Each structure stands twice: as structure tokens, then as C-alpha cells.
Amino acid sequence: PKVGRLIYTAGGYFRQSLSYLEAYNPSDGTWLRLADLQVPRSGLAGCVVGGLLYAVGGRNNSPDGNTDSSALDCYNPMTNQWSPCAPMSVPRNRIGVGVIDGHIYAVGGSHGCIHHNSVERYEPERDEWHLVAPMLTRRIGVGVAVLNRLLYAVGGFDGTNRLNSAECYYPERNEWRMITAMNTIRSGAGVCVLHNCIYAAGGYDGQDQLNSVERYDVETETWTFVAPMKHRRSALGITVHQGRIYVLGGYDGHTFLDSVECYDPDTDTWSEVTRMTSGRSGVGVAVTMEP
Numbered sequence: 001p002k003v004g005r006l007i008y009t010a011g012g013y014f015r016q017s018l019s020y021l022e023a024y025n026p027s028d029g030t031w032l033r034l035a036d037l038q039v040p041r042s043g044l045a046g047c048v049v050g051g052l053l054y055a056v057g058g059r060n061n062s063p064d065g066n067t068d069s070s071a072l073d074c075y076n077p078m079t080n081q082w083s084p085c086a087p088m089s090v091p092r093n094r095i096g097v098g099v100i101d102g103h104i105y106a107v108g109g110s111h112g113c114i115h116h117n118s119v120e121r122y123e124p125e126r127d128e129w130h131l132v133a134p135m136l137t138r139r140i141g142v143g144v145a146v147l148n149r150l151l152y153a154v155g156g157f158d159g160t161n162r163l164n165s166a167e168c169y170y171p172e173r174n175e176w177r178m179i180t181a182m183n184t185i186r187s188g189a190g191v192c193v194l195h196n197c198i199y200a201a202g203g204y205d206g207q208d209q210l211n212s213v214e215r216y217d218v219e220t221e222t223w224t225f226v227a228p229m230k231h232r233r234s235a236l237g238i239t240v241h242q243g244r245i246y247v248l249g250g251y252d253g254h255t256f257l258d259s260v261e262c263y264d265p266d267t268d269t270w271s272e273v274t275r276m277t278s279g280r281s282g283v284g285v286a287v288t289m290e291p
């Protein structure tokens, strides 16, 4: 842990794709409004490498069109500016991303009616992307997280069925292997890592948005439900900060939520902690130092 670290929410969707970049400070309850993305995007992912925030993929649903994004953009909190980076090989909307040893893995997502099982890896110093082994399953709305330098792709939608399946990427073998399937089918879940487990919170089972939350213990290979969130949500933002899980916004079939809930694993409870400045879903979230 270190002092100064904010939860950054980029992009999102409410009626159309959004360009907002806003940062929450758990220490004081405040929100900062920062530089807008150069292009509005929903269905993107956020991550951090080297103190810099990256916005990856997504789609621009605007009045004039609906364009899937191959973009990678980098925000520097020291300048409050976005800078374009090299684009991915293919547009990826409803993407999932994970960082291993300073490299960004872009996983799955859609391009029109195409559902991608393809995965590619970004090298920041070289500003280059290269394809890695594809997943065993095509997954859009996929949740991705990294634990112990292994990358997990959880749930999603293959174009016909929402999935309870999950798989793991072993970088030294450039190989994907299926792990135990979740107890619940989830597309658009928030996926993150806390302690020695991969959590999957919320999402959509094709009928309902979910409030259940389950975690995969990488040693025992089981999925166990924990306490459910107060509010059902899908297409939520998620991150971990100071040993707690934060879920931001999402859609529950009636409202684009502004609710932010925080999970304490020691008490197995969720608390409501703040509200976003407006309700939105399909955002990209990550933590880095304050600007």
C-alpha cells in the first residue's frame, strides 16, 4: 500500500458512450473530474503500468455512428493529458485486460458480430502489440484478472450463450487451460484478485443481472459464494484497493447505477461508500497515484 492512490473511472455508457475520466479518493470521499478521453468509449478496460493509466478498446456509440475501438490511450496523472499509443491488431469492444510483468494483455471482445477468442500483448517501452495464444473459448463481456503472474478469463458471452466457464493463461507455455467453471453463468461480471482468489461479482446470466459474488481459490480450484452485493449489477467497474473490492456503477435492468459498494473480506460484508457523479455502466477502472 502507498498514500495518494485514487480509483480512476474512464469512459462508460448512459444513452451513448462517454468520455469521462473521474477519480475517487477513498481517504476523503471526493471525486476529481480529469481530462476527457479523446474519443468517447463504452465497453473498454482500464489498467495501470508504471504509474500510467491505459484505456483499452471499447466502442464509440455516438449520434453519428457505432465504431468498435482498437485504440490504446495512456493518461499521465503528472500532466493530466491523454496520449495515443500503438493500436491493437483488431477492434475489441466489451474487452477484458490484465497486466503481467509490465505488459498489457487484451482479451477477447467483439468487432461487429465477430466474437474474439484472440489475445494480444502490449509492450509499453517498445510501444508494440503482438498476438499470443488465443483462448479456448470466444468471449465478449469477459472479466480478466491476474494473480501470481497467471492471467484468468472469466465468463462472458460467445454470441449464443452466456458462460459460467473460465480459463487461465500460463505465459511460459503460451497456453490457455480451462479451470473449474463458476457456479453461475456471468457475462459482464466485475473480475478482480483479492488475496489468493479470483472474484467474479455481478454480471448477467441472460435473464437477470446478478448481485451474487463468487471467488475461485487458485490452490483448491473451487468457486465459493461470498456475501452478495446490495445492488444487482452487470457491466460494472471493479478494482481492489487496500485489501477491499470496489464495484462501481453498472446496469440492473432499470437504472444505470451511480452506486459504489466496497467489500471487506475479513467481515464478508459490503458497504455503500460513495456515488459516482452520474449513473453509468461499461466503464474501465484502475488505481494509480493522484494527479
Ligand SMILES: Cc1ccc([C@@H](NC(=O)[C@@H](F)c2ccc(Cl)cc2)[C@@H](C)C(=O)O)cc1OCC(C)(C)C#N
Binding pocket: 012, 013, 042, 043, 044, 094, 140, 141, 142, 156, 157, 162, 187, 188, 189, 203, 204, 209, 234, 235, 251, 281, 282, 283
Ligand atoms: C461492458 C459489457 C459487458 C457485458 C455485457 C453483456 N450484457 C450485459 O451484461 C447486460 F446485463 C447489459 C445490458 C444493457 C446494459 Cl446498458 C448493460 C448491460 C453482453 C456481452 C451480453 O451478455 O449480452 C454488456 C456490456 O456492455 C453493454 C453496454 C456497452 C451497453 C454497456 N454498458
